[PDB]
Design a protein around this motif. Sequence first.
Motif, PDB file in Angstrom:
ATOM      1  N   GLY B 216      49.432  -8.381  -4.754  1.00 10.00           N
ATOM      2  CA  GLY B 216      49.595  -9.901  -5.446  1.00 10.00           C
ATOM      3  C   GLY B 216      48.940 -10.486  -6.398  1.00 10.00           C
ATOM      4  O   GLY B 216      47.681 -10.671  -5.614  1.00 10.00           O
ATOM      5  N   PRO B 217      49.725 -11.695  -7.004  1.00 11.99           N
ATOM      6  CA  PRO B 217      48.471 -12.482  -7.713  1.00 11.99           C
ATOM      7  C   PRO B 217      47.898 -13.156  -6.565  1.00 11.99           C
ATOM      8  O   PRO B 217      48.513 -14.029  -5.520  1.00 11.99           O
ATOM      9  CB  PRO B 217      49.072 -12.591  -8.898  1.00 11.99           C
ATOM     10  CG  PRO B 217      50.752 -12.808  -8.237  1.00 11.99           C
ATOM     11  CD  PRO B 217      50.854 -11.788  -7.063  1.00 11.99           C
ATOM     12  N   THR B 221      40.734 -15.858  -6.145  1.00  8.21           N
ATOM     13  CA  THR B 221      41.251 -14.302  -6.808  1.00  8.21           C
ATOM     14  C   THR B 221      41.920 -14.238  -7.339  1.00  8.21           C
ATOM     15  O   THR B 221      43.222 -14.764  -8.561  1.00  8.21           O
ATOM     16  CB  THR B 221      40.753 -13.982  -5.506  1.00  8.21           C
ATOM     17  OG1 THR B 221      41.737 -13.725  -4.830  1.00  8.21           O
ATOM     18  CG2 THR B 221      40.070 -14.413  -4.422  1.00  8.21           C
ATOM     19  N   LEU B 222      41.617 -12.600  -7.875  1.00 10.36           N
ATOM     20  CA  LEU B 222      42.347 -11.747  -9.219  1.00 10.36           C
ATOM     21  C   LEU B 222      44.082 -11.217  -7.861  1.00 10.36           C
ATOM     22  O   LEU B 222      45.057 -11.128  -7.987  1.00 10.36           O
ATOM     23  CB  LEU B 222      41.962 -10.791  -9.979  1.00 10.36           C
ATOM     24  CG  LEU B 222      41.320 -11.099 -10.924  1.00 10.36           C
ATOM     25  CD1 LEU B 222      42.001 -12.190 -11.422  1.00 10.36           C
ATOM     26  CD2 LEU B 222      39.793 -11.962 -10.439  1.00 10.36           C
ATOM     27  N   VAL B 223      43.366 -10.572  -6.758  1.00  5.57           N
ATOM     28  CA  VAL B 223      44.335 -10.106  -6.612  1.00  5.57           C
ATOM     29  C   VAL B 223      44.513 -10.319  -4.947  1.00  5.57           C
ATOM     30  O   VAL B 223      43.250 -10.372  -4.509  1.00  5.57           O
ATOM     31  CB  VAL B 223      44.157  -8.517  -6.828  1.00  5.57           C
ATOM     32  CG1 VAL B 223      44.244  -7.700  -8.141  1.00  5.57           C
ATOM     33  CG2 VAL B 223      42.965  -8.254  -5.633  1.00  5.57           C
ATOM     34  N   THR B 224      45.379 -10.064  -3.962  1.00  3.04           N
ATOM     35  CA  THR B 224      45.634 -10.177  -2.442  1.00  3.04           C
ATOM     36  C   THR B 224      46.422  -9.311  -1.980  1.00  3.04           C
ATOM     37  O   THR B 224      47.533  -9.415  -2.512  1.00  3.04           O
ATOM     38  CB  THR B 224      45.409 -11.988  -2.104  1.00  3.04           C
ATOM     39  OG1 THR B 224      45.521 -11.896  -1.044  1.00  3.04           O
ATOM     40  CG2 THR B 224      46.498 -12.590  -2.790  1.00  3.04           C
ATOM     41  N   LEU B 225      46.683  -9.670  -0.387  1.00  4.54           N
ATOM     42  CA  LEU B 225      47.950  -8.412  -0.248  1.00  4.54           C
ATOM     43  C   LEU B 225      48.522  -9.678   0.195  1.00  4.54           C
ATOM     44  O   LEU B 225      48.744 -10.920   0.241  1.00  4.54           O
ATOM     45  CB  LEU B 225      47.265  -7.816   1.361  1.00  4.54           C
ATOM     46  CG  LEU B 225      46.514  -9.308   2.429  1.00  4.54           C
ATOM     47  CD1 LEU B 225      46.862  -8.093   4.051  1.00  4.54           C
ATOM     48  CD2 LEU B 225      45.729  -9.974   2.152  1.00  4.54           C
ATOM     49  N   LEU B 472      39.951  -1.112 -12.086  1.00  3.55           N
ATOM     50  CA  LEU B 472      40.077  -2.475 -12.250  1.00  3.55           C
ATOM     51  C   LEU B 472      40.459  -3.208 -13.089  1.00  3.55           C
ATOM     52  O   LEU B 472      39.362  -4.064 -14.030  1.00  3.55           O
ATOM     53  CB  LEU B 472      38.623  -3.137 -12.317  1.00  3.55           C
ATOM     54  CG  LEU B 472      38.408  -2.893 -10.752  1.00  3.55           C
ATOM     55  CD1 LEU B 472      38.606  -1.807  -9.486  1.00  3.55           C
ATOM     56  CD2 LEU B 472      36.623  -2.979 -10.344  1.00  3.55           C
TER      57      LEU B 472
END
Lengths: 503, 504
Positions: B216-217, B221-225, B472
């Motif tokens: 998810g957003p 940071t760009l991506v995270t759980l 990426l």
Amino acid sequence: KTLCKSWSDMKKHLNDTVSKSFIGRFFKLEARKTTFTTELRAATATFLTMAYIITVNANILADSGATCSINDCSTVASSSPPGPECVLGSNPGYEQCISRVKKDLVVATSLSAMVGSLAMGLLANLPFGLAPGMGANAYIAYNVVGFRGSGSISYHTAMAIVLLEGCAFLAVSALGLRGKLARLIPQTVRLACAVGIGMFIAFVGLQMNQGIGLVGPDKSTLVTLTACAETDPVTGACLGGKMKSPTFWLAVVGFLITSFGLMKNVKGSMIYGIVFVTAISWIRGTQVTIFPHTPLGDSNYNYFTKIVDFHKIQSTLGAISFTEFRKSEVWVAFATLFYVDLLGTTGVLYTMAEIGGFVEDGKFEGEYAAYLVDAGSSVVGSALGVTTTATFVESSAGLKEGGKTGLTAVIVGLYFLASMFFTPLVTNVPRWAVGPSLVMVGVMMMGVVKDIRWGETKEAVTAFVTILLMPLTYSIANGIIAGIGIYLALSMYDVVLGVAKWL
Amino acid sequence: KTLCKSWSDMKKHLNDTVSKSFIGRFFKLEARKTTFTTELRAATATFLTMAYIITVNANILADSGATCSINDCSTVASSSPPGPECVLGSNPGYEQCISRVKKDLVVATSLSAMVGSLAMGLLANLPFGLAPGMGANAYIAYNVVGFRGSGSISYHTAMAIVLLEGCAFLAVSALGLRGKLARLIPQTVRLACAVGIGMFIAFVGLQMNQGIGLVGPDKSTLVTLTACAETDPVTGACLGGKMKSPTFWLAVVGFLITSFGLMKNVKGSMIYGIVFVTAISWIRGTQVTIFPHTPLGDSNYNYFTKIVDFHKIQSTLGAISFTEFRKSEVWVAFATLFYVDLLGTTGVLYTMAEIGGFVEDGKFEGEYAAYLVDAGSSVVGSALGVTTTATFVESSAGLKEGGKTGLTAVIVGLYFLASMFFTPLVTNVPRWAVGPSLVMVGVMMMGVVKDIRWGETKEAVTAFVTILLMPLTYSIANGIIAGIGIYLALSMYDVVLGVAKWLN
């Protein structure tokens, strides 16, 4: 035939006269054949690989807002916080506290790994390069403290947690169960641990935050190439331009230079890419300079004119207080990191013993005392200002050209002391300069791939998911945990059958 | 109890009858030492292996808004709906488009696969079926047309690209200058492109819109759980509570059963990881069903009652308009989609040749016909509504069982013929069932990574950057271009001087 044999005269007298000495019998440069002339080769090239922590660790921890809270940020015209604790950079007090914490954390990271490697190399003739790793900065700042204090946990208490973390791992190191558990982690997960390190490190060097700046946020895809010129001063949101920025097309050339240098077996080329970017970025007048005409950048040359300084530590040694610990919101994070740090840092240390052929019967020499320094240096680093020492998986560079015996770590620590004295020449490097070194380390860590048994499936499903998750989740814990959980489920029938015959 | 010996009693005479007839002379059953009894096993084993891409195709190509546009949404209190409101969902008329389009591309994929595979059976004598190949679908979906009107160009020119790609791919093998142009690429770049494509096709199966919904957003940071249960009511966003999504665990269970079924060498097993999750998410009552009490649910529920239906194509016909070819960003997509198609069929056909005994000292019996028919399959399935066609690696399942005749592929196509009769039963596949099957493709396509000469440092950088940049950047064309631009620079500065010295 003039300088051929003339330069060879001192090579023979140097390695021979140093082998038959008390140091030569302490570090055992008579058996486990490796010479002094090759250990310099193994350690000097090792040192430049780990040069990015002199910058990226301080860069990470300065964004968290280590010190200079509202008492120092708000000192001009507003007592109330300018948003979430002086988020905007156009605040006096902030503009010089950031420069101060960058200096302080650079001192801290140059002083920590000095004794991190020296102590571990002077006890069990172990050639590795322990230093404060990337497994804790991506969490302790961003999730616990948040973006410049955007969290419910104070930084002073964060250092208390990271301090008591190493004290707890000091006990388990003295018990030896950590080492006996290193033989229990599956072989495939342990192998895939190293590839995920390289992939995650390569990913972190591509953002606007502390990298080149390729990737960027997107409304629907969450990822897009936004290496534009007109950029958001706070975020990666492009104002337009779509890959017409020189910050890219000045690190690209440095990456090309280092790639070409490693092609023809140049001794040290990793610093050539750093130098070829730093020298051009140090010229005043261009659009790619690190020295704008703003007072924030003007104060840099007033200090950059000094080339050597000792810079005794001022305002990060300590900052430990058991004040917020009385509630439960601190122990939840403490436990979250507790059984994660060992599960994310024990596998890498054990892996490097197998690469160097240290183990002879499933156990390498000086195993029990190896973990003592890892558990102890974190304690001194935490109170000094840095996070835990994660025992970098980077000495694979040093193991490839004859690095077998000890004293390799102590001579790298000697260089780490050398880098401290040139403190104006480390804190003044651009964040688009150290970027190519990360992806260089990442491609370097592609050599473990062709060792995993990809013929079967049970040993192939776990490795792929472990490789995928860590860079795509921006977390180190979520990779090994998922690899363990996937491997355990597939071996359920075998365990059930084994315990069925236990009757 | 005489059926035990009767088994052989008929298993012999059906073999003589087919062999002694003109049908046996058509496919040369006497030659190659093949019979008819082995054909059922040679066909069903291959069918069960390619049975997976009959619904993943629909769920991948159905999120494009292929046929309707901003014009035909519903009506609201304002004058007319704006642009960015219809395409984000939560509208009756746009969901009606998506339902009528998912009901149509399932039939379209099967109809295109019929032409792809029956022609293999009747013109090449080479036993492997063809359906719109997996790997080129994601590029067209998520870099060319985008997610629900995203990107910059529409579906009409997306289908128009295929016609012009086919008109040229037919005329690169007709004159025979196909392999003469295939060696323009060094071996490392294609090897990195395959694994990077496998990586990208897996990363797309871990998001909120398409996959399970793990990542998810984030603001910093760009991506995270995320893995959050209470998602955003309109868009895809997290609210609170992680790793307790009831939809997440079912997909994990399905993936576990798929990986377990791969063990012990079950011929067709990955369809189980789809049917098992669909059966659970077919009955109502709980909150992980695809049939809610919303009016969409009842309208969709009075479509599962009927099991078979002759769903005719009525909306997604050829929509070929050349009104957008006068700009640049379409030619790059055409070139990339031509490029990835060249290395696929060529790199797989020879690998299939060296198994079964078909291989000889180059240029075996089924050389010429196969490339031409495979190229024509892309242009014949283009106006239907699907992407290009490619030979599947998992077609070796029937090959490894003695299959050597062209009767295998025509029979394989007949099984795909019955698929369009089962149309309404497969449209209802949920978007959390494709997830495990989408992730699984990467495991199968990444097994070739142990061939790059990682010892040499000149090609390891190119292979690593090609691997890294595609997942990426959410694109396929970007990574190959970046790899070419890096690989070229490392050699010209060292080879041009030598060439000039040799020329002087």
